[model samples]
Target: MQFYQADVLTQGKPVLLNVWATWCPTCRAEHQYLNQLSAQGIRVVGMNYKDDRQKAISWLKELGNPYALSLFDGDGMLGLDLGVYGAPETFLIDGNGIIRYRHAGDLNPRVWEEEIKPLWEKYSKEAA
Candidate 1:
């Protein structure tokens, strides 16, 4: 419990939602960077899509939970609706609940700095 920090949405910034699963190899690859993002006060929500729930719990505890809240999507119905075909997909939704940016791959340092961070800055600064 209390794995992630509070007040993630306090500033009304855009949120980063990561659609991932415990069994995804790329998910494991980006786990640490996600943690770093969380530690930096970025609100990263982990969506565990149709995975073994217990294994997900163990995975987070083992690798260090990095999400403000990790969501469990049973049956992957939500993922199906969202057009997510696989794991390690990322999303950036503004405070007004608009999907402003998306990436269908694991997040790396360069992508974070070059790809996502710019949009984050643009959207987070806009009126929520």
Candidate 2:
């Protein structure tokens, strides 16, 4: 319900929302890739799923936070509303809050090239 919604439709740009958990292995596996993209000005938004404040903070510190404005889903409250099945699900939402693409698994170099990158570019064009 209370998911982070950007003030305006950030048109001409793409948004990557990663719903993940500190304890999820799949989420951990994609840390580096997510962090890398975050550094590249990719507008990465992280959803801390069903995690406590302390644990989530510690996890971010340990895994190198890769979020621009991370949204906290402390009790799986928002996650349930978002139709999140589990942790490490990545959603590519357009500037207009439209779901452009969805990756319901771990991100890696393989998935990046095969799925994320292509779809990102495609939606980037659409957003423009």
* Best candidate (score: TM-score): 1
Runs of candidate 2 exceeding 4 Å displacement: 1-3, 6-12, 74-81
* Model 1, TM vs. native: 0.81
Cα shift from native, residue 122, model 1 (Å): 0.6
True lDDT of residue 38, candidate 1: 87
lDDT tens digits, residue span 6-125, model 1: 234323568887888877788887998889888888888777876888998899999999987677754322212345344778888776656778888888888899999999988877
What are the runs in model 1 whose C-alpha is more than 4 Å off? 1-11, 75-86
lDDT at 99, model 2:
70
Candidate 2 lDDT, tens digit per residue, 1-128? Answer: 34433433243367777877778877666877888887877878777777776788887898788887766764322212345355778787776666777888887888878888898888777777
Q: What lDDT does each candidate get?
A: 0.74, 0.71
